UniProtKB/Swiss-Prot annotation:
Catalysed reactions, semicolon-separated: N-terminal L-glutaminyl-[peptide] = N-terminal 5-oxo-L-prolyl-[peptide] + NH4(+)
Disulfide bridge partners, by residue number: 69-82, 93-191, 100-122
Native source species: Ixodes scapularis
Family according to the record: Belongs to the glutaminyl-peptide cyclotransferase family.
Primary site of residence: secreted
Glycosylation sites: 30, 261
Name the UniProt record assigns to this protein: Glutaminyl-peptide cyclotransferase
Tissues expressing this chain: Detected in salivary gland and midgut.
Subcellular location: Secreted
Domain of life (superkingdom): Eukaryota
One MF annotation (Gene Ontology) recorded for this entry: zinc ion binding
Amino acid sequence: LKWPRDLRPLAHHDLLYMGQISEEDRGDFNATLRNFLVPRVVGSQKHREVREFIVRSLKDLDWDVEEDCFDGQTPHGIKPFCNVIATLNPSACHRLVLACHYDSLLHKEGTFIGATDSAVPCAQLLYLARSLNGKLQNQKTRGDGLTLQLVFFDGEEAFERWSSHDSLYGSRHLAQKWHEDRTSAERLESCLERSEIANQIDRMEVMVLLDLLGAENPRFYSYFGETQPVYRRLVNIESRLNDAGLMELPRRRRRTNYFSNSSTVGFIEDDHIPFLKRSVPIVHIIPSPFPDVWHTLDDNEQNLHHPTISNLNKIFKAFVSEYLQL
Ligand SMILES: [Zn+2]
């Protein structure tokens, strides 16, 4: 089966531009990232501050922002949860959805920053919205029926031992909410010819979920055959960036190889699951293996690898540009 949207290769000019960074771009990203490098456990003041910062940053860019708030039972009692959904053009039928979670694990051993999990992904999504703002606002005027949507899930982490009932609180809630929210092509702006739209979940054209990013030398694989055409664009973009000499490497004459051209046999539970169960196509941008710092007190700021983060930001910027033809 072909991808429902013909995927036009990024022109060289655009690839080079998406692959550059000024030191002020680096500084802008780091400034954004500092806002997330704090404990943000569900129910806490800093958690509320982080949500407020996400919401304000995106409202300031003239995105439509929904705070999807609810209370849910947990092994620790009733807890408040608030997903944040930012949509560049609400009326556009189809959404390229980029996602991550913004809560941090309540770690039994002490204060836990969750720098890779997922403070960096949070910052990457905001940095994309900020750095591509002009181009995105231009794209929004086309009436082409496609837009960008950013979802910051709350309550990804378990309070106790990960289970179907203790984990993915925000994503389980949102997927069900959108599945039950009925709509059709006539109510929406420029749906593709062959689109079957019965509810809001059908408008998610593909969900690209970023998680556990920020450690050196991540290895990604295509986890879903369904989105192999999309995944292959990340492979190609990374290859073109290396060919252009636009990746930061430790030594001359090396290449990044983050996006492997293989598939793996690996089952990961994450925020994508409740959407996958409802036929949303998923690209899961998560390393295999997980970073060594995963769910340890060492998942902190100093253990981030900034050259890797810069390289990923170039891939992601080029990918959004290519998908939306910015
Ligand atoms: Zn985690």
